[PDB]
Design an enzyme around this catalytic site. Structure first.
Site, PDB file in Angstrom:
ATOM      1  N   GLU A 175       6.572  -9.960  -9.113  1.00 17.69           N
ATOM      2  CA  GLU A 175       7.710  -9.175  -9.615  1.00 17.69           C
ATOM      3  C   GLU A 175       8.714  -9.085  -8.580  1.00 17.69           C
ATOM      4  O   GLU A 175       8.315  -8.496  -7.429  1.00 17.69           O
ATOM      5  CB  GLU A 175       7.367  -7.757 -10.008  1.00 17.69           C
ATOM      6  CG  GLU A 175       8.641  -6.722 -10.116  1.00 17.69           C
ATOM      7  CD  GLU A 175       7.864  -5.313 -10.281  1.00 17.69           C
ATOM      8  OE1 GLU A 175       6.767  -4.934  -9.959  1.00 17.69           O
ATOM      9  OE2 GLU A 175       8.513  -4.508 -10.773  1.00 17.69           O
TER      10      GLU A 175
ATOM     11  N   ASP B 226       5.083   2.405   5.544  1.00 19.65           N
ATOM     12  CA  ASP B 226       6.492   2.675   5.843  1.00 19.65           C
ATOM     13  C   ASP B 226       6.807   3.747   6.670  1.00 19.65           C
ATOM     14  O   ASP B 226       6.122   4.948   6.476  1.00 19.65           O
ATOM     15  CB  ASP B 226       7.410   2.897   4.430  1.00 19.65           C
ATOM     16  CG  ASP B 226       9.045   3.106   4.859  1.00 19.65           C
ATOM     17  OD1 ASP B 226       9.269   3.183   6.020  1.00 19.65           O
ATOM     18  OD2 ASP B 226       9.460   3.255   3.770  1.00 19.65           O
TER      19      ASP B 226
ATOM     20  N   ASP C 251       9.433   6.313   8.539  1.00 20.03           N
ATOM     21  CA  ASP C 251      10.937   6.883   8.321  1.00 20.03           C
ATOM     22  C   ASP C 251      11.273   7.775   9.392  1.00 20.03           C
ATOM     23  O   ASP C 251      10.494   8.754   9.791  1.00 20.03           O
ATOM     24  CB  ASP C 251      10.991   7.539   7.042  1.00 20.03           C
ATOM     25  CG  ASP C 251      11.226   6.541   5.905  1.00 20.03           C
ATOM     26  OD1 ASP C 251      11.956   5.410   6.282  1.00 20.03           O
ATOM     27  OD2 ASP C 251      10.986   6.877   4.648  1.00 20.03           O
TER      28      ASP C 251
END
Ligand SMILES: Nc1ncnc2c1ncn2[C@H]1C[C@H](O)[C@@H](COP(=O)(O)OP(=O)(O)OP(=O)(O)O)O1
Ligand SMILES: [Mg+2]
Ligand SMILES: [Zn+2]
Lengths: 234, 649, 388
Positions: free
Chosen positions: C43, C108, C110
């Site tokens: 996808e 991730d 941040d």
């Protein structure tokens, strides 16, 4: 072959008389009911609990401590009894949990009575893929393991062996930062391996129970087995 | 805080909708109070060249709207939920904020305004107000009448929804206010496009020119007023005196006893064209001709001339026949055929409401005996036709007050067409105006109960070739109070049963698919949106005395008490049954769709959706077929058989 | 030079035409063609003009990945999970037969999670002098996924403005269930950030090795970052927040200790002395709590726990910063300059002033050589596992 505790797979293929068919079911029901009384009236560590449960297991001809070779008959008895009782206690959801809880308790008891050193072969005989560590390896990582230990008091790394497991199988442990992880392998004390063994047995037992219930209408066609499937809670 | 408007100046009511629908637009946005506009907003406004005016306070925004409407001078104001919430909000804001010259909202000068469609229509004197909700409810049947569902169905496009809570967050950046303004503009465009696609205005003009009432009353719905004015004109034209304004009850249709089961052979279906109007025209049923005072009056003498009622209903019948002839034409645009279908359905409802108004206790022309007589004649016609078709050594399996279903037991199409034509001629020879037609020819039919059957309809194409189209009537799959999961499973079962395969393979296919559903439901691979149940509210949520025992009203009070938009009578509520852990009943554990993805202690109740939603539908569908039973479905789905039937050991 | 957003539509056509490394981007995601449709079930999500966010897209081969996305020119590209069927044909699939099967382990980091320790930049921007905190994160996680868990194939990519992403794509990792991902996230999480609670780091006397080797690493950069670069012990509101973590019984001595000094080095020295004095009479490891609460990496649970969650693909162009998302060289992590990362405008200018190897004539060659090295290393395991 270690007929004193067994993960129940590979259903049998022998044939038996119907009288023995009913006797096995009733004996297993009696033993599993008495496990309830022993687990309720007493606590899980007294010598009286062990003595009473092993005496009753002796009374009903069921497998116990592995030091006397050819008890093939108790092995066959237990193997047939579990599978014959699987058909009855798989109908209602109030009985499946009752079956699983007390069978897990019985397996805990059977596990606690293995002497010390036949445990390793058993782990390989149940498709579990576990390992032990030698004394030099234990001394090499002694400080690391005792630092990684849970709230267990003391630095003394006792004679209890430390087992080596793939990390994915120790999810309940390394999530809480209570074990040692190295090269994708978890190191656990012997006390906590019981929890993972029972937890992995529970899922397979539940899956087997579910897969038997949906293919059980085919077995009700036999007219000789109707009393058994409906009168084990009568 | 934000209002956007679109304007067109040359909209034609005697021609298709203009392209593009709009020629002008504007929009105004204002800050709430404590917050301030994000900086550099003016520079971005000049950059993107958007016709947006920034206001200081709310009062300036109201003044801008009231001043702009005077210059534009609109004649038809179209919107969504105008009569329910928007207009009241606007008028109350004008009053509390003390806006100047409120009378600019209409076309007349007034001093004091009333408050609460009576007050709204009075306040908007001189301008027609159109609400897409009312017109859509009157012309098209859908599952929900919000803006999102209408955009999804009529326009075939997805629309983004901005919740009330997030409005405060998006006051920090200029781009977020721009997104809010653009979303409002897109909503206005969607409303205009829906109005243009449904062709509401030409239909309203035609109906108002038929009945003779005021055009503004037509757009608010209702069928009694149109009939009242139509009969008033009819009686005044013939020098009469009408009754003054005011300052079950009789036998209805006949439904035959069905023959439940499955049919593989061809089935004819014979239907009457405009039954009740045909009866009225045939037997001269009218106010002047029929004597009156629960008793059925006698038929009038045939020598007397036609009455007022049949002459007026003949015109509606002729208009419908005119529309159908245009529908018959070849090589038509696909949207034009749907517009004509909507037009003919509206005319049919207008024609059939003239009979209904005869039994309305508050109608200006209440007459029970007339409706009783027409129903009696309808029952007599149905019984006589059934006897005559049975006399020809043929079988009748179903019929609903105007129809007869014949089991021809043949397999060749030409002979069944010939038999249908013969029976049609034999029936039509008896009467003068009444006619009977072959509505369709079925291939395989599953008849469950009264008003419940699924079938395949044979559609010819050319040279003896025919296709089949699946149709349903009355099943649980066509209702809105069932989850999409059960409807999809039932549709699969219906598709499997009516196929041409052997009876052995269908049972295995059903077993496999049900096992897969049972595994997937517990696994949790099915999205949340397929667990929703939609129910409509009849009375206001606060007015329900049994609020505790009904799930949808329980959700309605919550969504009113914490949320924004308030749900009123006629709106729909979506609810899902989840696990709370408080050990209450299923009907007392309803939660909102947004209440599940926000909280943590709630989870989808698989037992309810697997033992009370899926199982009943597939158990009712497969009742006439053999080899499938409730206990077998219970075992296949992974349920406990002990509840449903079992019992004997 | 400052990046100009208005010229973004013009440059994006060129960058997708002659600069995007298509060959390695396909060879990476196809995973050697061993699996029967491992690429056709992937996808992709594209961010097109007018803020249109379309989710389900699929491709057939390299040619489709070329022409279909060239005709679209998206602003941003994200990679999803390998589903059971082709994602673009999800409307027609069976009722519930559509579910995810595999995805890489994504991590991730941040910058916005460090707002209560930061004293220099804004919540959405960075400066050089503090960017070292990022590397202080990497060396904690990079070791953890290397020695403790034994994962071999990891790729570290610059997010583009305020973070670095880490893709783990070992063969056994890609098939892990959600519970194992949650557990491996928990094993790497230490700062329990509550509802704006001053104290977020807690520990006991017993020390896990993973939390001790982390201290051994953080000690190398703490004095350079917190005491000199950050300089968080200069004025009253600089150390009041630090004292908030310290029990109030020691604030009386610590205020006088910090009052008579001039810079944060002696502040830290006196703080360590007083903390050790507190430990001797009473353990809680006060000196370590402040370092762990100001400097330990913080990860988002939501970005990593899910199996179908979308994440920005490498070598995409951020709409605002314009910098290309480039991989990090694992052996010179300390030698990475965030502001050296090439911009789409700069590389387009280089290309204009000039078998297809035009990326080699652009400054992007050293940053794609690491990608080539990653794929070459992964192919080693590919041929060492199946063929041996
Ligand atoms: N909505 C309604 N309101 C009042 N009466 C109705 C309504 N629907 C149907 N009826 C009554 C009057 C009709 O003559 C009768 C049969 O209706 P129906 O079979 O739908 O169509 P119809 O016989 O009027 O002809 P057509 O097939 O041309 O639409 O039922
Ligand atoms: Mg009809
Ligand atoms: Zn900084």
């Amino acid at each position: 072959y270690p007929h004193c505790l067994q993960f129940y797979l590979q259903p049998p293929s022998e044939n038996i008389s119907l009288i023995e068919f009913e006797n096995l079911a009733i004996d297993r029901v009696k033993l599993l009911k008495s496990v309830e009384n022993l687990g309720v009236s007493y606590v899980k560590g007294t010598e009286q609990y062990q003595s009473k449960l092993e005496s009753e297991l002796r009374k009903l001809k069921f497998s116990y401590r592995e030091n006397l070779e050819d008890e093939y008959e108790p092995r066959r008895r237990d193997h047939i009894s579990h599978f014959i009782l699987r058909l009855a206690y798989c109908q209602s959801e109030e009985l499946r949990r009752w079956f699983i809880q007390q069978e897990m308790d019985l397996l805990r008891f059977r596990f606690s009575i293995l002497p010390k050193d036949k445990i390793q072969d058993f782990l390989k005989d149940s498709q579990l893929q576990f390992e032990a560590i030698s004394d030099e390896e234990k001394t090499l990582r002694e400080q690391e393991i005792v630092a990684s230990s849970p709230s267990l008091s003391g630095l003394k790394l006792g004679f209890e062996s430390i087992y080596k497991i793939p990390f994915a199988d120790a999810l309940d442990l390394f999530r809480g930062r209570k074990v040692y992880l190295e090269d994708g392998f978890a190191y656990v004390p012997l006390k906590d391996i019981v929890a993972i063994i029972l937890n992995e047995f529970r899922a397979k037992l539940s899956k087997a129970l579910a897969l038997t219930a949906r293919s059980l209408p085919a077995v009700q066609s036999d007219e000789r087995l109707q009393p058994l499937l409906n009168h084990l809670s009568h | 805080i934000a209002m956007a408007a679109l304007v067109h100046h040359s909209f034609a009511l005697d021609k298709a909708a203009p392209k593009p629908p709009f020629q002008s637009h504007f929009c105004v946005v204002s800050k709430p109070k404590d917050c301030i506009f994000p900086y550099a907003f003016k520079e971005v406004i000049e950059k993107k060249n958007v016709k947006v005016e920034v206001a200081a306070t709310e009062r300036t925004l109201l003044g801008f709207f009231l001043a702009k409407v005077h210059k534009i001078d609109p004649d038809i104001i179209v919107g969504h939920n105008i009569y329910g919430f928007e207009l009241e909000v606007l008028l109350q804001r004008i009053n509390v904020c003390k806006a100047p010259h409120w009378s600019k909202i209409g076309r007349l000068k007034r001093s004091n305004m009333p408050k609460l469609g009576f007050g709204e229509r009075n306040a908007t004197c001189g301008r027609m107000i159109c609400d897409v909700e009312i017109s859509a409810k009157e012309l098209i049947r859908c599952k929900s009448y919000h803006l999102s569902e209408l955009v999804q169905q009529i326009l075939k496009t997805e629309r983004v929804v901005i919740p009330m809570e997030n409005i405060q967050n998006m006051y920090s950046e200029s781009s977020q206010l721009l997104y809010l303004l653009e979303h409002t503009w897109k909503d206005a465009k969607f409303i205009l496009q829906i109005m243009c696609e449904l062709n509401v205005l030409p239909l309203a003009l035609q109906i108002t020119n038929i009945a003779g009432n005021i055009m503004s009353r037509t757009l608010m719905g209702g069928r009694s007023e149109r009939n009242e004015f139509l009969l008033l004109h009819a009686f005044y034209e013939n020098n009469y005196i009408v009754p003054d304004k005011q300052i079950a009850a009789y036998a209805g249709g006949l439904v035959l006893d069905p023959k439940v089961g499955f049919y593989d052979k061809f089935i004819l279906l014979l239907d009457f064209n405009s039954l009740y109007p045909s009866i009225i025209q045939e037997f001269n049923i009218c106010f002047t001709t029929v004597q009156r005072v629960e008793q059925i009056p006698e038929l009038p003498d045939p020598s007397l001339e036609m009455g007022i009622l049949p002459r007026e209903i003949r015109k509606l019948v002729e208009r419908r026949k005119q529309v159908k002839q245009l529908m018959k034409q070849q090589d038509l645009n696909p949207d034009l055929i749907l517009q004509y279908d909507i037009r003919q359905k509206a005319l049919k409802l207008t024609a059939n409401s003239m009979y209904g108004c005869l039994g309305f206790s508050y109608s200006r022309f209440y007459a029970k005996p007339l409706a009783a007589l027409v129903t009696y004649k309808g029952r007599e016609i149905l019984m006589h036709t059934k006897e005559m078709v049975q006399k020809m050594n043929l079988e009748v399996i179903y019929g609903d007050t105007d129809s007869i279903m014949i089991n021809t037991n043949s397999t060749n199409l030409e002979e069944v067409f010939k038999l249908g034509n013969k029976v049609k001629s034999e029936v039509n020879k008896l009467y003068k105006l009444l006619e009977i037609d072959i509505d369709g020819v079925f291939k395989s039919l599953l008849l469950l109960k009264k008003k419940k059957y699924a079938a395949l309809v044979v559609e010819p194409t050319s040279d003896g070739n025919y296709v089949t189209k699946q149709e349903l009537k009355g099943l649980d799959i066509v209702r809105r109070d069932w989850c999409d999961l059960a409807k999809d499973t039932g549709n699969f079962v219906i598709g499997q049963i009516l196929s041409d395969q052997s009876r052995d393979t269908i049972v295995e296919n059903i077993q496999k698919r049900l096992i897969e559903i049972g595994e997937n439901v517990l696994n949790g691979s099915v999205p949340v949106s397929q667990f929703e149940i939609n129910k409509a509210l009849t009375k206001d949520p606060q007015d329900y005395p049994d609020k505790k025992s009904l799930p949808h009203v329980h959700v309605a009070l919550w969504i009113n008490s914490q949320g924004g938009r308030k749900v009123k009578a006629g709106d729909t509520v979506s609810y899902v049954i989840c696990q709370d852990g408080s050990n209450l009943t299923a009907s007392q554990r309803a939660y909102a769709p947004e209440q599940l993805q926000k909280q943590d202690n709630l989870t989808i109740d698989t037992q309810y959706y697997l033992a009370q939603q899926i199982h009943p539908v597939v158990a009712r569908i497969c009742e006439p077929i053999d080899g499938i039973d409730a206990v077998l479905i219970a075992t296949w789905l992974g349920l406990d058989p002990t509840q449903f039937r079992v019992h004997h050991y | 030079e400052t990046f100009d957003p208005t010229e973004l539509p013009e440059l994006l056509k060129l960058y997708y035409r002659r600069l995007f490394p298509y060959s390695q981007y396909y060879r990476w995601l196809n995973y050697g063609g061993v699996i029967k449709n491992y690429f056709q079930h992937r996808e992709f999500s594209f961010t097109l003009k007018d803020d249109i966010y379309i989710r389900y897209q699929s491709f057939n081969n390299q040619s489709d990945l070329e022409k279909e996305m060239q005709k679209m020119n998206p602003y941003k590209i994200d990679i999803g999970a390998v589903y059971s069927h082709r994602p673009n044909q999800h409307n027609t699939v069976k009722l519930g037969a559509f579910q995810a099967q595999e995805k890489e382990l994504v991590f991730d980091i941040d910058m916005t999670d460090y707002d209560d320790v930061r004293r220099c930049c804004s919540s959405a921007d960075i400066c050089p002098k503090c960017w070292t905190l990022m590397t202080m994160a990497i060396r904690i996680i990079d070791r953890a996924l290397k020695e403790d868990f034994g994962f071999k194939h990891r790729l570290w990519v610059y997010s583009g403005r305020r973070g670095v992403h880490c893709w783990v794509c070992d063969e056994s990792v890609r098939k892990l269930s959600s519970a194992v991902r949650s557990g491996i996230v928990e094993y790497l999480s230490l700062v329990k950030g509550g509802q704006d609670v001053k104290k977020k780091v807690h520990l006991s006397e017993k020390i896990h090795p993973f939390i001790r080797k982390s201290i051994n690493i953080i000690k190398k950069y703490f004095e350079e970052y917190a005491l000199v670069n950050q300089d968080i012990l200069e004025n009253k509101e600089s150390w009041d927040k630090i004292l908030a973590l310290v029990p109030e019984t020691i604030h009386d001595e610590l205020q006088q200790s910090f009052q008579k000094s001039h810079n944060s080095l002696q502040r830290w020295e006196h703080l360590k002395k007083v903390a050790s004095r507190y430990q001797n009479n009473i353990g809680p490891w006060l000196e370590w709590e402040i370092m762990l609460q100001y400097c330990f990496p913080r990860l988002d649970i939501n970005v990593s726990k899910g199996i179908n969650h979308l994440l920005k693909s490498p070598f995409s162009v951020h709409p605002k910063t314009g910098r290309i998302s480039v991989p990090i060289d694992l052996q010179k992590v300390d030698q990475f300059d965030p502001f050296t990362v090439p911009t789409i405008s700069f590389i387009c200018r280089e290309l204009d002033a000039i078998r297809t190897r035009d990326y080699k004539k652009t400054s992007l060659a050293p940053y794609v050589k690491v990608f080539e090295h990653f794929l070459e290393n992964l192919d080693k395991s590919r041929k060492g596992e199946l063929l041996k």
